[PDB]
Amino acid sequence: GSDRTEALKRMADALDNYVIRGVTHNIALLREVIINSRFVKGDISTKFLSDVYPDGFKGHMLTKSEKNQLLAIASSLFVAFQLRAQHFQEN
């Protein structure tokens, strides 16, 4: 990027657009580090991962709005599948 913010934003977007199937992968951790408020402020050290995740990595934690968005997306996808199930060709 032209500045640090642009580079971090394009990364987050790149990690969300990365398709890897057949193995487990660390994209979830990488994506969470890149958006973490300490990392974005540059408040980082060699202990960053132990300090930010003492219990362990539990994956992203959704805010009420994020949870509502995820639920809406899932419901829309379910309804879209159900609807496509009804589109037979002419008989």
Partner: protein
């Protein structure tokens, strides 16, 4: 009371089946009532019921008492729609006389079956019944036969599906056996002609109902059931999904629905799936998932005779049947159970105009005295005949080995196949290279040079390709595209055969 009020009374009584306490007892077992099952299975507001007020006419053993009269008489029958397509359904009501079959029960089932055959729509039966109603004696037997005949008359005309959702014993077990597909619910359904008590009394064997006829037994050992589901709800959802695949009758082509997966999508992951060394196995299910639309595959008998794989999928939105050898299990060798499992699926697919796709990697048939004494010859002939008889489009891809008569059985081009393809790892030969060299050159000391020349000249797909046994040798990554193209060309395939009442398949 007026006639109208008696009508509401009868409607209300029928809607409750055998009573609220019976319904509660049913629920505590973890089972749904017949009407709840119908509601879950059909499109909302589409169920039209038939013969609500039909009652049994038995007059023996106090069966004519008003307390023994139930409107509907332990079965709910009618029609509905699944995803907008017409279907006829009957559901057995366990809360009325334990779901025993009486004259009226069989009469209602036969009425719906006759209607379905008249209009040409599939039939779905949810089975939960103790057996014949002993109080009606021979009458019950007659009803069973009336059903059986219709099943046989409907075979190959309209698809028939059975879902065992409760106890099912005695002659009642035979009707599901005559249908095309049988599904079972785990831990709450079972099938057996004779119960455990008679088994103990006669053969001095100790067994439970689950062991004798549980879903696991009939999905892993007897090869009677095609799928087992966790719950009534899960079973019904999967039943709707499965029904989406089938055509309504044998007069209709394979269903074609809206498709988003491009028909020319490449599959580079297949270019190295097959190991070079013939001593290492791979998973054919991975290839099947890669090739089919959206990686969606409805497998049949997934836990029975795992050395072969059969199922339903879609190519470019068109329903197709998949048959493939499984090198991951028993080296992919054919045997009795796998032969039967493949043969019946192939015959069903052919009967209803569903194209067939085959993936071939087979070294031969399983050896041993157990296979010979079990009649491996006739069982393998079953699958061979199934492929030879089919007139639907047939597409075959050889990934690795195809040796001896097993190559012929697996839809070889000589069985009037349509298109046959070979991957670069294909090997079409009478037998293994070492055995062929032993037989041919035995009695010559310079074995090594002759064996090297033989392997160089024959341990590859060239011998078949040069004779036209395979239409082409294709890069694995293009597989899907090729198949799709062929399925578009062969959709209008038509073949002429000599007249006959029917064939005589080995049994």
């Amino acid at each position: 009371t007026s006639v109208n009020e008696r009508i509401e009374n009868k409607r209300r009584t029928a809607l409750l089946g055998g009573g609220q306490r019976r319904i509660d007892a049913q629920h505590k077992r973890g089972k749904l009532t017949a009407r709840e099952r119908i509601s879950l299975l059909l499109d909302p507001g589409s169920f039209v019921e038939s013969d609500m007020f039909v009652e049994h006419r038995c007059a023996d053993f106090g069966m004519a008492a008003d307390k023994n009269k139930f409107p509907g008489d332990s079965v709910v029958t009618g029609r509905g729609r699944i995803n907008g397509r017409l279907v006829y359904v009957f559901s057995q009501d366990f809360t009325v006389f334990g779901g025993s079959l009486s004259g009226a029960h069989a009469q209602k089932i036969c009425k719906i079956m006759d209607q379905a055959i008249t209009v040409g729509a599939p039939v779905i039966g949810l089975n939960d019944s103790g057996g014949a109603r002993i109080q009606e004696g021979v009458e019950s037997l007659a009803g069973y036969a009336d059903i059986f005949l219709r099943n046989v008359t409907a075979s190959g005309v309209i698809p028939q599906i059975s879902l065992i959702m409760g106890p099912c014993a005695g002659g009642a077990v035979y009707s599901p056996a005559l249908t095309d597909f049988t599904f079972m619910v785990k831990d709450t359904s079972y099938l057996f002609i004779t119960g455990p008590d008679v088994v103990k009394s006669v053969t001095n064997e100790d067994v439970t109902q689950e062991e004798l006829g549980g879903a696991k037994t009939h999905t892993t050992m007897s090869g009677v059931a095609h799928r087992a589901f966790e719950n009534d709800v899960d079973a019904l959802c999967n039943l709707r999904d499965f029904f989406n695949y089938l055509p309504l009758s044998s007069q209709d082509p394979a269903p074609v629905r809206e498709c988003h997966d491009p028909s020319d999508r490449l599959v580079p992951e297949l270019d190295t799936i097959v190991p070079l060394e013939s001593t290492k196995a791979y998973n054919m299910v991975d290839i099947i998932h890669s090739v089919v639309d959206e990686r969606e595959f409805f497998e049949i008998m997934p836990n029975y005779a795992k050395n072969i794989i059969v199922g339903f999928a879609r190519m470019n939105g068109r329903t197709v049947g998949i048959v493939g050898n499984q090198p991951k299990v028993a080296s992919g060798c054919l045997d009795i159970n796998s032969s039967v499992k493949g043969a019946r699926f192939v015959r069903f697919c052919d009967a209803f105009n569903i194209p067939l796709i085959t993936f071939v990697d087979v070294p031969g048939f399983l050896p041993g005295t157990a296979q010979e004494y079990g009649g491996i010859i006739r069982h393998g002939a079953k699958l061979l005949y199934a492929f030879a008889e089919a007139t639907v489009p047939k597409v075959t891809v050889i990934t690795r080995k195809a040796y001896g008569g097993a190559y012929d059985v697996m839809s070889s081009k000589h069985l009037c196949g349509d298109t046959n393809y070979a991957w670069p790892t294909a090997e079409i030969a009478v037998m293994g290279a070492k055995g062929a060299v032993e037989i041919i050159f035995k009695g010559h000391e310079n074995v090594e040079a002759a064996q090297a020349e033989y392997i160089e000249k024959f341990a590859n797909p060239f011998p078949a390709a040069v004779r036209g046994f395979v239409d082409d040798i294709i890069q694995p990554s293009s597989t899907r595209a090729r198949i799709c193209c062929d399925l578009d060309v062969l959709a209008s395939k038509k073949v002429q055969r000599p007249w006959r009442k029917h064939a005589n398949i080995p049994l």
